[PDB]
Design a protein around this ligand. Sequence first.
Ligand SMILES: Nc1nc2c(ncn2[C@@H]2O[C@H](COP(=O)(O)OP(=O)(O)CP(=O)(O)O)[C@@H](O)[C@H]2O)c(=O)[nH]1
Ligand SMILES: [Mg+2]
Ligand code: NA
Ligand code: NA
Ligand code: NA
Length: 414
Amino acid sequence: AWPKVQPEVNIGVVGHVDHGKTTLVQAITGIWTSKHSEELKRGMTIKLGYAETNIGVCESCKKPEAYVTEPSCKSCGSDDEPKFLRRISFIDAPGHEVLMATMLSGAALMDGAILVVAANEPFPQPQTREHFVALGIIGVKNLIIVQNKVDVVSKEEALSQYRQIKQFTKGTWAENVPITPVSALHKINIDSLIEGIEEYIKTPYRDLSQKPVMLVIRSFDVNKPGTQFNELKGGVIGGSIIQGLFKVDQEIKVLPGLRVEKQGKVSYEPIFTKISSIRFGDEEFKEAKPGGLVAIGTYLDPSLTKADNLLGSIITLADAEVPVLWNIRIKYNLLERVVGAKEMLKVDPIRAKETLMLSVGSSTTLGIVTSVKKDEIEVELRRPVAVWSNNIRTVISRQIAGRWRMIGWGLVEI
Ligand SMILES: Nc1nc2c(ncn2[C@@H]2O[C@H](COP(=O)(O)OP(=O)(O)CP(=O)(O)O)[C@@H](O)[C@H]2O)c(=O)[nH]1
Ligand SMILES: [Mg+2]
Ligand code: NA
Ligand code: NA
Ligand code: NA
């Protein structure tokens, strides 16, 4: 039998709207990531989606068909159990331009990524570009490019686009990134993609001695309506562990924490609590390591965690020393052009007093530029940000025609 373990690696799925990210994740895992009513209704990803699968290989069979996502080799005529390789999980990002920030949040949780490119749409589309560049900036460079929807175009058309993709990646960090043609919808050539995932998105080394840090993207509670009020389960906080590991009964804190109102004046106070449970998907564990999306059960009042209230927070051990900053200095670099815009547009230099959007970890925060230099800006934040390390990368966005567009990036200076 295959072991029941947590996913050991996170693979982002990104790309332009409707190019088939969620359907690809379904093709691989059997799971439709969209759980929210508005997502199902509007037919779009809004919040980050999530799905896990085991990966195995039938050692006596021919590749890529030998790769399986369930413990059976019957499809290659063997009654032998396939060799378990690892459990993996997917971070399914929204493609809509208006949701770029969400993609950015998800990118902080990715060990590698799949860029989905629709074979029946002109390449390169705005968010194909924006997601690609964002991946490059953030350092998610273990990339597979998937040409999806090949089922509706001839092989020749798909090859023409393939040539375009090679042209696009040439001279960039992605020059030798593999391109794999599939049909996510009708499940064609998925095995080649599994093989490619095993080859190009290896589980990274984890230094489990590092201080535990989790980036928070969800928060909620299991309590069904009409639940007896003093028998409510504690709040649950969901996210991904980016370093170290957490264990049941650990004393933890959520940073920056809780918004506090004092005569209409606002501060943030760390939220202290204790880990009552650890879960990945449908399985309970006693500890939680990088890879996968974890649900940390706590003793918190469910009202504190309701409706993703804590999105963008981080969680550390209670005694961790972590700067929570209302002002930050950023060593920055700007892109030459607003890659995510439909019509070509140059990036204007940063101006003092302008409002910028900053993506840091899973958080998204508006701030006012208080100082501009050639290599550095200083920003007064509308809300504080937890900065858990010295070389944290931030992505900078500017509001352009009412739309937040990525325009640069930088290092948060301590
Ligand atoms: N013909 C064909 N259609 C596909 C394929 N993959 C996805 N689609 C279709 O494209 C549409 C959008 O698919 P979906 O998987 O939701 O794309 P998405 O990129 O996650 C959309 P969003 O960016 O909002 O998250 C759906 O109608 C879906 O059935 C494919 O391989 N072939
Ligand atoms: Mg989707
Ligand atoms: Na990463
Ligand atoms: Na085809
Ligand atoms: Na190029």
